Amino acid sequence: RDPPGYRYAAAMVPTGSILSTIEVASHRRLFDFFAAVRSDENSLY
Amino acid sequence: CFEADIAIPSGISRPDAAALQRCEGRVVFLPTIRRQLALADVAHESFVSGGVSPDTLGLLLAYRRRFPAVITRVLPTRIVACPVDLGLTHAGTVNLRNTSPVDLCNGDPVSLVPPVFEGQATDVRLESLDLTLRFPVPLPTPLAREIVARLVARGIRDLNPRTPGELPDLNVLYYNGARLSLVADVQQLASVNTELRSLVLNMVYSITEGTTLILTLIPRLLALSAQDGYVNALLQMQSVTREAAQAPMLMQDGERRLPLYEALVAWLAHAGQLGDILALAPAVRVCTFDGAAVVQSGDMAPVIRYP
Amino acid sequence: CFEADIAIPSGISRPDAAALQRCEGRVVFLPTIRRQLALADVAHESFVSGGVSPDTLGLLLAYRRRFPAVITRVLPTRIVACPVDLGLTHAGTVNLRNTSPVDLCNGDPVSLVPPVFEGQATDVRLESLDLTLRFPVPLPTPLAREIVARLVARGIRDLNPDPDLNVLYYNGARLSLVADVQQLASVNTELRSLVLNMVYSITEGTTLILTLIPRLLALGYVNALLQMQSVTREAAQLIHPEAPMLMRRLPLYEALVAWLAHAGQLGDILALAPAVRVCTFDGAAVVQSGDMAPVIRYP
Amino acid sequence: ARHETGGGVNFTLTQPRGNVDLGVGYTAVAATGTVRNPVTDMGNLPQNF
Amino acid sequence: HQPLIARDGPHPVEQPVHNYMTKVIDRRALNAAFSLATEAIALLTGEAL
Amino acid sequence: WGKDHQVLRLSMENAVGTVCHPSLMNIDAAVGGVNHDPVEAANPYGAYV
Amino acid sequence: WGKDHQVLRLSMENAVGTVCHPSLMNIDAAVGGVNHDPVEAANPYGAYV
Amino acid sequence: HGQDAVCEFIATPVATDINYFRRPCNPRGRAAGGVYAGDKEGDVIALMY
Amino acid sequence: LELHPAFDFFAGVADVELPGGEVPPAGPGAIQATWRVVNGNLPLALCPV
Amino acid sequence: SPVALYHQLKTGLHPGFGFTVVRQDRFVTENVLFSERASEAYFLGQLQV
Amino acid sequence: ETTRVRADLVAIGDRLVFLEALEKRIYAATNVPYP
Amino acid sequence: DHGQSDPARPFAATANPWASQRFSYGDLLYNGAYHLNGASPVLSPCFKFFTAADITAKHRCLERLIVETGSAVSTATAASDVQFKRPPGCRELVEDPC
C-alpha cells in the first residue's frame, strides 16, 4: 500500500514529465499500483 | 457522528493492514455504544454462540441484537465507526460501500443481509489476530424481502421431508434478468423454529371478526379473471386462490362497530408487518447528489437516514 | 437545509405566474437531488410509469419513492425549496399550507394522495407550458392512517353490492369525507387497482394458512404454543371459516414466499410513515386551513 | 453557495447566465455524415404483452 | 427593414412591415464545487499550529 | 442482416409473444366507440335469427 | 487448400481415431454429475418396466 | 510442408445450420468468453453452462 | 436432459429394480440413463425425416 | 456401438450424426514497433566478477 | 519547479472560417461525452 | 376519416384496415390512451405511431419544426440491456427524424 503510496508521495515531489495523455483506467491492468484523483484525499495531507 | 473508535489491538500482518483499507464503507456489528472497544467482539467468532455457529437465519437473529456501525476513517491505530442506531445525524451523509452483485437504483431503502451468496462470501482472514470476517451485503429492500421468505420456507422444508427429492429449490432469484443462486448448506432448527412461530402467531392476530366477510368474495375474484388484464396478471398461477375455488354466518351483534373497517386494521398490524419482524430494520436510503440514477458494484454511495 | 433550485421554463402568462404565487409553501416531490433542477421533474406528467396515468397506487409507489421538497420562497426564473430530507434532526424550520383538518401542535404530518380529498382541488395546472402540479396532502399520522383504510373498505361495498363508513369525527369537527356530486364515482375507479391489492393479499394468506397449520404441527415447541396464545381464537377461526369455505405442499411453499413477497410490498405501500414534524414555537398550537405553520425536519 | 456536511465544509459555486439567438434568419446548420456503429444489433426480439 | 421590389401592373401595392420582433433570454446554472477535508479547517484559519 | 454477416431468422412463430395474449378478445370498448350516433338498420336478413 | 495449391481430403473415415476409442460409452461421471439436486417425479409411463 | 496440425472431432447434430458457420464462432455452439461478462461474480461459468 | 448421441437421460423412478411390479411406488425423483441401441434412436429434431 | 462405428465409417455410411473439426495452426509474423519519447527509465548498476 | 493565438483558418469560396476541433484539448479526460 | 383517401397512397383510403381506423386493433393495442400495455418498462417501438393524442396537431409551424430535430429527447435509452422507455432523468439530445 504505502511502499507503492510513498511513490505517490514522491510523485508529490515531482521531476517527471509525462508526454502523451490518454485515459488511465483503460490501462488499469498494466500498472503495479493505481491511485485515483478524486478532487481530494484525506491521506495525502 | 457521536464518535466511536475501535483501536488496532495487537500487531499487524503487513498486507492485512491494507486489507483494512479496502473495507472502507463496510459495516461492523458491535454490540454496544463505546468510546473505545476491542476488536474481539467485532468478528464472526463473536457471532458464533456457545459451541455452535449461527445459520443464515440465525445470523439474522444474531444481527438482531447487535448494533451496525459504518467504517468512516481507517487509521493504523484505530478505526472510527459511527453508530447507525443513533449517530445517523449526518448532513454530510457518511458514505458506505456497496458490496453486492445488484446495481441498485436511486432511492432504494437499503437493509443489511448476511453473506449468503454463492460467490460474494466477503471472507477476509486475519491470522496475526485469529479472526474471521463476514461483511453484510447491502441490498435493496424488496429484493431483501424476497430473500428472507425463501430461506425460512427452505427451513420449513427442513422439518418435513414425504415429497420426492425433486423439490423447488427456492434458489433461483429474479431482478429484471439476473439469475441468482444462493447457498443451502445448513439449517439450524431453533433459528427456523422461532422464525416460524412469529410467522404463525402474527398471522393469528391478523384475522378478525369482520375479516370473514371478505372470504365470501373469493369466487368474485375469478369473475374479473377472464375479462381484464390487470386482475389476471395479479392472480398468480402458483397460488392457492385458483385452487381454493373448487356465508355471512349471521351472529350480528349491534352492527355499529364498522366490522369491515376494523378488519383491515389488525390485518395490517401483523400481516402488514412481516418483513421487518423476521429480518433487520431498514435505515439506509440511496441518495446520490450528482444525479446519478444507479450506483455500481463496489462504489461509495452517499447514505441518508431512516426510510 | 441545502436549498435546491427548480428552473422555471419559458414563456408563461401572468395567471400562470399567479399560479406560481398561490403555491408558496406547498409540498413538491422530485426524483434526484441535483442542485439545479427543472420543472420537468416535478409535474404529474412526470409520474407516468407504464404509459398511462398513475392511480393512487401508482402515486403512492412514487410518493414513498421520490423525495419531498418544500418551497420557502417563490421566484421568477427559479424555485427555491429548502428540502426536508436533508439536514440533521429538528433543524431548518419550514412552513406549510394546511388543508381542512387541524394539524395540531404535534402530529408529524404525512404527504399522501390528492384523490382521497377533492381530486381537482390542488391539481394546479400551468396553462402556457400545459403541465399539472398535483400537490400531496399533509395529513397527521392518526387520521392519515385512518382515512386510508376507510375508502378501500368503502371500495368493498362499492365492489359487489346488495353502516355508512363516511362520517369520521375529528376531535372537534365533523369531517365530511364524501364530496358526493362528482368525486365518489371517480373515487372507486381511481382507487380501482388498489382495492384488489388489499383483497388478494387477504384471500391468499388466509386460504394459505388454513392449509399451512393443519399441514404443520404433524409434519414441538411451536406446536403446542401455536394455539397457546390462540386458544379459542385460531381454533375458533378454524371452526368458523373452514366450515363455510373450501379446503399440495410443493406449490404451497412456493405460494408461501409469493404472498409474503406481496406482503412486504404493501407495508412499504401502506401505513404512510411520518416524514416531517410540526413542533412549533410561540404559536396558538392549532393550525387552520390556509394558514402557515412552522414545521421541523425529522420525526 | 456553502453547505456543511459530514467531513468538512463543501463550497458550491455557480454562475447564472443566458443566451439569445440574435439572428433574424437561420444561422448555424449542422450536417451529419460519418457513422461509427449501430448501438443496437438490429433486432430479433419478441414483444411480450 | 426588408426590401421592396414594388411592382408594375394592377396587382395591388406592396407594404413595408418594418416590424419589431422580440426574443427571450434563457437562464442557466453552470454549477461547480470542490471538497475540503475534516482537517485543514483549523488549518488555513490559524487554530492548530 | 445483423450487425455482422449475421443472417437472422424471424419465422412468424416469433410472433407468439404478441398475438397469443388474451388482449385479442377485447372489443368491448370498440362496439361502444361505434354505436354512438347509430346507423339505421340495413335490410336485416343476415343479421337476425 | 494446404500450404500450396494443394487440395486435401477429410473423408469421414478420418473419425476412426477420434471416437472409436472406448471412451464413448464412459459416462459414469455424467450421471454422477447430474444425480444430485434431484429431479421431481416426471409421470413415468415409458420409464418403468 | 512443415509441422503437422492435429484435427480433433466433436459430435454435432446434422441439422445444426451452416449459417452458424461461415462466421467466427466457438466450436461448442455457445459463446463462452469471460470478456463478454459484466462483473457479477456469477457471470463466470453460468455464462458457459 | 439430452447430453449424448449413444445414450438417453430421463427422469425416472428413484430406486425400483426394473423387471418387477405393475405401478412404480412414486416417491422421490432420481434421474437415470439408458443405452441408445441404434442410429435411429436419436430424436427427430436432430434428424430430418 | 464403437465397434459398429468402424464398419459404418470404414465403408462410408453416414452414421446418423455429424461433426466439426478443430485444428491449431502457427505463423511467424513481422512486427513493426512505434514508441513515445520517455518510454522507459533505465538504470545501469555496477559490474562484478 | 488584442493578440495572436494559434488556430487553423481555411478559406473557401470567398470566405474564411476558424476550422478547429475540440476534445483533444478541452473535453479530454473529464468524463464528458463530446457533444 | 376513411371516407376520404390516403395522402400517402392517393388512390385509396388505407393500406391496412386492421391498422388505420379508430378501434382498428392497433388503436386498442398501441394507443397509450387505452394503455393495456404501458405498465411495462420495455419501450414499445410503435408508440410514435397509433397515438392520436400526441399527433393531435403536435405543432404545425414548419419553420420552427425542423430545428427541433436536433432536439426532442428520444423515447429510447441506450443505458439498458434490453432498451427501456425513458426514465425522466438523464436527457439525451437525440436527432430522430421519424
Side-chain angles (χ1 to χ4, degrees), chain A residues 3-22 24-40 42-45, chain B residues 1-2 4 6-13 15 17-23 25-34 37-40 42-44 46-54 56-64 66-72 74-84 86-117 119 121-122 124-126 128-129 131-145 147-157 159-161 163-168 170-184 186-194 196-208 210-227 229-235 239-242 244-245 247-249 253-254 256-261 263-275 277-289 291-298 300-307, chain C residues 1-2 4 6-13 15-23 25-34 36-40 42-54 56-63 65-72 74-84 86-107 109-117 119-122 124-126 128-129 131-145 147-157 159-161 163 165-173 175-179 181 184-214 216-218 220 224 235-236 241 243-244 248-249 251-253 255-267 269-281 283-290 292-299, chain D residues 1-20 22-49, chain E residues 1-7 9-10 12-13 15-26 28-38 40-46 48-49, chain F residues 1-4 6-12 14-36 38-39 41-49, chain G residues 1-4 6-12 14-36 38-39 41-49, chain H residues 1-38 40 42-49, chain I, chain J, chain K residues 2-19 21-35, chain L:
Chain A
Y6 287 168
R7 297 288 194 268
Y8 201 86
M12 294 300 293
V13 173
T15 61
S17 294
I18 305 167
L19 283 79
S20 62
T21 64
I22 61 171
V24 184
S26 294
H27 297 281
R28 176 59 190 85
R29 290 172 285 177
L30 173 60
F31 285 103
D32 195 1
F33 171 65
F34 179 75
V37 281
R38 297 284 297 171
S39 180
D40 191 0
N42 202 1
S43 63
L44 284 181
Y45 297 111
Chain B
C1 182
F2 187 72
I6 292 175
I8 305 299
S10 297
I12 283 297
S13 296
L20 295 178
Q21 305 301 322
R22 66 174 63 89
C23 293
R26 292 183 183 271
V27 177
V28 170
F29 296 101
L30 55 94
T32 42
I33 295 296
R34 299 293 175 89
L37 183 64
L39 197 67
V42 170
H44 186 269
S46 67
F47 287 154
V48 173
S49 68
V52 291
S53 179
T56 189
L57 299 177
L59 286 172
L60 293 173
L61 302 173
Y63 292 169
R64 185 66 56 84
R66 289 193 187 190
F67 294 151
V70 173
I71 286 97
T72 62
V74 176
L75 294 174
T77 63
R78 292 180 292 170
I79 293 169
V80 178
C82 208
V84 177
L86 175 69
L88 188 52
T89 62
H90 287 283
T93 64
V94 58
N95 295 315
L96 195 71
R97 182 173 177 85
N98 190 2
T99 308
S100 66
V102 174
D103 194 356
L104 309 174
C105 275
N106 192 1
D108 286 335
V110 172
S111 61
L112 300 177
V113 170
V116 75
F117 286 92
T122 64
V124 57
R125 296 296 307 276
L126 298 174
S128 298
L129 289 171
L131 292 178
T132 65
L133 290 174
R134 297 186 189 180
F135 292 104
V137 179
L139 293 177
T141 48
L143 194 145
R145 287 179 178 175
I147 290 168
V148 187
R150 292 288 185 90
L151 303 178
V152 173
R154 182 175 57 85
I156 291 172
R157 289 172 175 175
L159 177 63
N160 47 359
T163 60
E166 290 180 352
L167 286 84
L170 301 177
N171 204 356
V172 171
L173 277 75
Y174 286 155
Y175 181 74
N176 291 319
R179 190 261 188 189
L180 295 176
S181 64
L182 305 176
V183 178
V186 62
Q187 292 293 107
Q188 286 181 353
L189 270 296
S191 67
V192 170
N193 285 315
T194 60
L196 198 153
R197 182 181 180 271
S198 67
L199 189 142
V200 174
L201 184 58
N202 287 314
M203 288 179 73
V204 171
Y205 291 100
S206 67
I207 310 166
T208 54
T211 306
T212 313
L213 282 75
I214 291 96
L215 278 299
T216 312
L217 281 79
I218 296 171
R220 190 58 180 85
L221 294 172
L222 296 176
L224 292 167
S225 176
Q227 63 183 356
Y230 178 76
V231 176
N232 199 0
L234 179 64
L235 294 173
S239 175
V240 72
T241 305
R242 290 177 183 267
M249 298 295 288
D253 195 1
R256 185 179 60 84
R257 62 182 179 179
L258 276 71
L260 292 175
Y261 174 71
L264 298 178
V265 176
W267 185 79
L268 185 146
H270 293 279
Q273 288 185 355
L274 291 171
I277 57 99
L278 294 175
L280 278 75
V284 175
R285 190 179 185 178
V286 176
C287 176
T288 62
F289 296 93
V294 293
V295 170
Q296 296 293 106
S297 68
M300 294 300 290
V303 164
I304 57 169
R305 207 165 298 114
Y306 179 76
Chain C
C1 183
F2 183 68
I6 295 171
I8 298 297
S10 68
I12 66 166
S13 65
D16 283 328
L20 296 172
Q21 296 307 110
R22 289 182 286 174
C23 296
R26 298 291 186 93
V27 181
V28 168
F29 280 147
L30 45 82
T32 59
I33 319 98
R34 189 190 286 261
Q36 182 178 2
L37 289 176
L39 190 142
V42 182
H44 184 265
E45 291 83 1
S46 66
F47 292 155
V48 180
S49 64
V52 296
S53 175
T56 57
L57 175 66
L59 291 176
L60 282 178
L61 285 172
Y63 290 176
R65 176 64 59 84
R66 70 177 69 190
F67 295 145
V70 178
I71 301 166
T72 64
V74 290
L75 287 179
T77 68
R78 284 179 65 193
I79 294 171
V80 169
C82 180
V84 175
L86 285 179
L88 56 92
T89 63
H90 303 285
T93 301
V94 80
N95 300 320
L96 288 176
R97 296 184 66 85
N98 199 4
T99 314
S100 178
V102 170
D103 301 342
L104 286 81
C105 185
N106 288 318
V110 183
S111 299
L112 49 94
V113 291
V116 70
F117 283 97
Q120 297 299 318
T122 199
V124 176
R125 178 176 171 83
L126 291 175
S128 178
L129 53 91
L131 291 179
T132 302
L133 300 176
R134 293 179 64 188
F135 301 96
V137 178
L139 296 178
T141 49
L143 175 132
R145 294 177 184 177
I147 301 179
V148 66
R150 188 69 63 84
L151 279 78
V152 64
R154 194 177 71 189
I156 302 300
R157 295 181 181 180
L159 179 62
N160 197 3
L165 298 171
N166 297 319
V167 184
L168 204 148
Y169 290 157
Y170 203 69
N171 62 8
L175 297 180
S176 66
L177 179 63
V178 171
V181 62
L184 270 71
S186 65
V187 165
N188 289 316
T189 187
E190 281 186 350
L191 277 75
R192 174 63 175 84
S193 67
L194 188 142
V195 178
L196 302 175
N197 288 314
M198 200 69 196
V199 169
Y200 178 70
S201 180
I202 287 174
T203 64
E204 178 69 28
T206 59
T207 57
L208 194 146
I209 189 174
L210 293 177
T211 181
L212 179 62
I213 306 300
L216 204 271
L217 284 72
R248 290 185 178 181
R249 291 184 183 178
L252 181 63
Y253 294 158
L256 192 149
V257 176
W259 175 76
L260 197 146
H262 195 279
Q265 295 290 107
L266 298 179
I269 292 168
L270 299 173
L272 289 171
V276 212
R277 281 186 67 88
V278 169
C279 194
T280 74
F281 176 69
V286 166
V287 180
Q288 297 299 318
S289 177
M292 297 298 172
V295 180
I296 64 172
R297 177 172 285 118
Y298 181 78
Chain D
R2 309 177 71 252
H3 192 186
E4 290 79 353
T5 66
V9 297
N10 293 316
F11 293 96
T12 63
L13 302 177
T14 179
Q15 186 166 6
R17 65 180 62 184
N19 57 344
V20 76
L22 199 67
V24 58
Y26 279 89
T27 314
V29 293
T32 304
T34 305
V35 288
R36 286 190 181 178
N37 51 356
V39 177
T40 58
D41 54 356
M42 298 177 188
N44 199 1
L45 167 59
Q47 168 54 40
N48 191 0
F49 287 162
Chain E
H1 304 89
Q2 73 275 14
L4 286 85
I5 314 174
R7 298 183 55 83
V13 183
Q15 183 60 252
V17 281
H18 293 166
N19 50 359
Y20 293 164
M21 289 183 71
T22 187
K23 296 294 182 69
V24 172
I25 302 168
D26 295 332
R28 297 298 179 89
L30 283 79
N31 50 4
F34 64 96
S35 64
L36 197 63
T38 178
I41 300 173
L43 280 75
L44 299 166
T45 53
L49 277 76
Chain F
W1 283 347
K3 202 251 186 68
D4 276 330
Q6 198 62 39
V7 49
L8 293 175
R9 177 178 58 85
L10 288 177
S11 70
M12 296 177 68
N14 193 5
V16 65
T18 290
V19 73
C20 292
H21 181 271
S23 60
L24 185 62
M25 298 297 172
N26 289 319
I27 47 94
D28 47 356
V31 62
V34 74
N35 202 4
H36 58 85
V39 67
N43 62 15
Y45 168 73
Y48 177 74
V49 174
Chain G
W1 287 349
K3 199 190 168 181
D4 270 328
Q6 282 288 112
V7 59
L8 290 176
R9 178 179 58 82
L10 295 180
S11 65
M12 285 184 65
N14 198 3
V16 61
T18 302
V19 62
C20 292
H21 179 274
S23 65
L24 183 65
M25 303 295 107
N26 190 7
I27 58 168
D28 52 354
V31 64
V34 73
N35 206 358
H36 65 87
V39 71
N43 60 16
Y45 168 73
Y48 183 72
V49 182
Chain H
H1 297 281
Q3 201 174 18
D4 296 331
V6 175
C7 302
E8 287 193 351
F9 290 150
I10 292 97
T12 62
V14 285
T16 61
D17 48 354
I18 302 299
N19 295 118
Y20 178 71
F21 290 170
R22 60 177 65 89
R23 181 179 176 272
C25 67
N26 267 324
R28 60 187 295 267
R30 184 183 184 88
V35 186
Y36 293 160
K40 299 282 102 175
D43 47 356
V44 202
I45 307 167
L47 190 273
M48 184 175 179
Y49 280 159
Chain I
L1 303 180
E2 169 59 35
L3 280 79
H4 186 77
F7 294 97
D8 289 328
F9 295 96
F10 56 93
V13 303
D15 296 330
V16 182
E17 177 63 29
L18 281 77
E22 183 177 3
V23 174
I31 195 162
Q32 68 179 359
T34 187
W35 184 61
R36 290 184 179 179
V37 178
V38 296
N39 46 358
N41 302 124
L42 66 94
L44 288 179
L46 270 67
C47 178
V49 181
Chain J
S1 72
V3 173
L5 260 65
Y6 282 172
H7 307 281
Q8 303 166 2
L9 297 170
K10 293 296 288 185
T11 313
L13 193 141
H14 187 73
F17 65 98
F19 287 103
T20 182
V21 182
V22 172
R23 66 182 56 167
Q24 190 62 252
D25 195 77
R26 179 167 172 81
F27 298 105
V28 169
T29 68
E30 285 176 349
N31 294 323
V32 299
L33 180 58
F34 182 73
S35 172
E36 290 288 335
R37 298 186 71 249
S39 303
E40 287 287 329
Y42 195 73
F43 291 96
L44 278 81
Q46 179 59 46
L47 292 169
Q48 64 184 359
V49 176
Chain K
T2 63
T3 183
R4 293 180 184 270
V5 170
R6 298 292 303 274
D8 300 328
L9 275 302
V10 291
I12 285 96
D14 45 356
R15 292 180 75 95
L16 185 57
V17 294
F18 269 92
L19 180 58
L22 304 177
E23 90 172 10
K24 292 179 179 179
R25 300 176 68 184
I26 54 101
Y27 271 88
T30 59
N31 297 317
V32 176
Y34 178 67
Chain L
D1 193 1
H2 296 99
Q4 294 179 356
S5 68
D6 192 2
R9 202 174 69 192
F11 55 91
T14 83
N16 188 6
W18 291 342
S20 65
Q21 304 173 2
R22 193 180 292 112
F23 306 100
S24 178
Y25 174 71
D27 185 73
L28 292 175
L29 295 183
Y30 291 166
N31 202 357
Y34 298 155
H35 49 271
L36 298 179
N37 298 316
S40 66
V42 176
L43 177 66
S44 175
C46 295
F47 179 69
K48 187 184 288 187
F49 303 99
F50 298 93
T51 308
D54 289 332
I55 319 295
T56 306
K58 160 69 177 67
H59 194 192
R60 194 168 164 83
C61 186
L62 180 58
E63 296 83 359
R64 177 64 68 188
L65 180 60
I66 64 170
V67 309
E68 303 175 356
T69 326
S71 294
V73 182
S74 69
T75 65
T77 51
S80 295
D81 301 333
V82 175
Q83 53 186 359
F84 288 163
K85 62 171 69 176
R86 180 183 60 85
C90 291
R91 291 176 178 174
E92 296 86 0
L93 299 176
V94 190
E95 193 268 322
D96 190 75
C98 295

